[PDB]
Amino acid sequence: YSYDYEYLYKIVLIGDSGVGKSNLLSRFTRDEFNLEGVEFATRTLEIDGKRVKAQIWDTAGQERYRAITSAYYRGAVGALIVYDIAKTESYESVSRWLKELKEHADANIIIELVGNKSDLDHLRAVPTEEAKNFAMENNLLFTEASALSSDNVDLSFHQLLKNIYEMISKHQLE
Amino acid sequence: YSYDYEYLYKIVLIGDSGVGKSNLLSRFTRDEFNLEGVEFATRTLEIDGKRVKAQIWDTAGQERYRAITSAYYRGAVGALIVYDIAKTESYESVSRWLKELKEHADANIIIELVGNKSDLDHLRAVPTEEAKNFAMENNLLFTEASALSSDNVDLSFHQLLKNIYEMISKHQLE
Ligand SMILES: Nc1nc2c(ncn2[C@@H]2O[C@H](COP(=O)(O)OP(=O)(O)O)[C@@H](O)[C@H]2O)c(=O)[nH]1
Ligand SMILES: Nc1nc2c(ncn2[C@@H]2O[C@H](COP(=O)(O)OP(=O)(O)O)[C@@H](O)[C@H]2O)c(=O)[nH]1
Ligand SMILES: [Zn+2]
Ligand SMILES: [Zn+2]
Ligand SMILES: [Zn+2]
Numbered sequence A, B: 001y002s003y004d005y006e007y008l009y010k011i012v013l014i015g016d017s018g019v020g021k022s023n024l025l026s027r028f029t030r031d032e033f034n035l036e037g038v039e040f041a042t043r044t045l046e047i048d049g050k051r052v053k054a055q056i057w058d059t060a061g062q063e064r065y066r067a068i069t070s071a072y073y074r075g076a077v078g079a080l081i082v083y084d085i086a087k088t089e090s091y092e093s094v095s096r097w098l099k100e101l102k103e104h105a106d107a108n109i110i111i112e113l114v115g116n117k118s119d120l121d122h123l124r125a126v127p128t129e130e131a132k133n134f135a136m137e138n139n140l141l142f143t144e145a146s147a148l149s150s151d152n153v154d155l156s157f158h159q160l161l162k163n164i165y166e167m168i169s170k171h172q173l174e
């Protein structure tokens, strides 16, 4: 048998404007997607037998013109860095978002690199192997996804929460 | 170092009308007490290094005339059975509340017996040793408390949440 309790994880979504952060959230939490306020959404799912309440934060679009404030990252245990596989610029900015996390987020936050818009294969600018190699180099989890076609969307969120739970537990047997 | 995450525990308060359930809640969550809606309150505190968000439920007084519905107990990991040390009847009803928990609450809910109104020592009807012996007999945690004078109030809630966390963890090394 198992006891009746929940884990509270705060996750933040970061990345350049237009990479599909808000559509990743609406696809995972409400299964909706829009071709071009709601501060965060919560979905609860089972991770290795345990119930995990994931509170996933999303921007209001201010990252297009200014830097995200420190309060956005506070309390977050995981983070998704989203880029556009069809936009090189959005992939080059991954280092900037890594700087943002080191500067305002928890020192041991668990990071996952997400390559969104995998449906635009005719416009692919960033090869999967380049970003996958970069993720392992910087000890980030990695997947490509498509909020439009729902490919690997649940995988991007389940992979991070599963790694958070296991990395926490593994850290607990000190 | 420790990761940034929380545990969500639902706790319910049960006992006969007038034993001091609502005043136990206001004393622990808001440090207020009244001499003779708000469905539940949440207070977060540190249990053995970890952060535990306790959601403590309280009745609207319907237990005076009818039985508490099943939905009140659903999801609860712990429960406080409160009686009046100055009212024998309220102590005799502890078996009824144990029946209520077996009937509508989780099969492995952790129960604590609380003897409230310890300040009315001139009116003591239930000796501490009788209820303490009864609690160990039925594998309940036990303390006396006074919502009026704040004695053992934080102890009654901290003792239960600490036992819940450790009993869960101890159950986890299957
Ligand atoms: N083709 C495609 N377009 C997407 C995808 N995800 C988002 N978009 C589009 O990208 C634009 C910006 O998306 P949005 O979620 O607002 O990006 P955000 O600024 O990071 O939140 C929208 O017009 C979406 O239609 C995807 O997986 N595939
Ligand atoms: N002397 C004393 N009176 C108390 C204590 N706790 C509650 N009361 C009184 O008992 C009455 C009923 O308390 P209440 O919290 O509403 O009981 P409930 O029905 O179980 O919620 C109130 O008038 C309180 O003033 C206590 O620790 N000591
Ligand atoms: Zn957005
Ligand atoms: Zn910054
Ligand atoms: Zn009450």
Ligand SMILES: [Zn+2]
Binding pocket: B067, B099, B100, B103, B104
């Ligand atoms: Zn019943």
